[PDB]
Amino acid sequence: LMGGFGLKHPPPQILIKNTPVPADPPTTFNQSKLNSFITQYSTGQVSVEIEWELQKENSKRWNPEIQYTSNYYKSTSVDFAVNTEGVYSEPRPIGTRYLTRNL
Amino acid sequence: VGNSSGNWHCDSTWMGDRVITTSTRTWALPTYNNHLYKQISNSTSGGSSNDNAYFGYSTPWGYFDFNRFHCHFSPRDWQRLINNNWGFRPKRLSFKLFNIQVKE
Secondary structure, three states: OOOOOOOOOOOOOOOOOOOOOEOOOOOOOOOOOOOOEOOOOOOOOOOOOOOOOOOOOOOOOOOOOOOOOOOOOOOOOOOOOEOOOOOEOOOOOOOOOOOOOOO | OOOOOOOOOOOEEEOOOOEEEOOOOOOOOOOHHHOOOEEEEOOOOOOOOOOOOOEEEEOOOOOOOOOOHHHOOOHHHHHHHHOOOOOOOOOOOOOOOOOOOOOO
16 A cells, blocks of 8 residues: 555564673673673675566657656755765655656 | 559667667659759858859759758657667668659
8 A cells, every 4th residue: 555566475684683702701600691791783785686577668649758867957966875974865856757657 | 554663661670789760751852943944142042241152053952951950759669769879870871762653
């Protein structure tokens, strides 16, 4: 209902955690689980490649259609670009329904 | 006499790297100058200045002129060419004349 593709077997969930690394344990055995750990965090890169199948438009319409276009008028800052502080922002929500087709 | 000479092809085909735009039309040809070659000049057209002065000939012949982009591309095809391509140039042309009728 929120849009998208309903899948019975969607991309699985990739779960990840940092393996615990205990701090120096007592020098005498204590049955209690170790609660002291070395503080750490991990970083790194992640890539995600998706192949999409398209269905090209074969419109035999005569007059021009409605395309999504960045309005030609001059602005302070380009749309879908970083401002003067390096903060990227998407100004409006873009849908897909632009091209028309008969019913 | 009782069989068509050709068919009506008037659509574009996009093959990724190229587009073939066909365009059929119906024409009418009258008899010009009553079959005569007449010499024309700026004085026959009602005289003019020296900048508009000319000397040429009229002929009984008509000619086909498809030298305009709208004779080939529809407003939609033109938009599909203008929004997606960086350049374009023509490669080959194929003119055909058919279904001729000489009414009297």
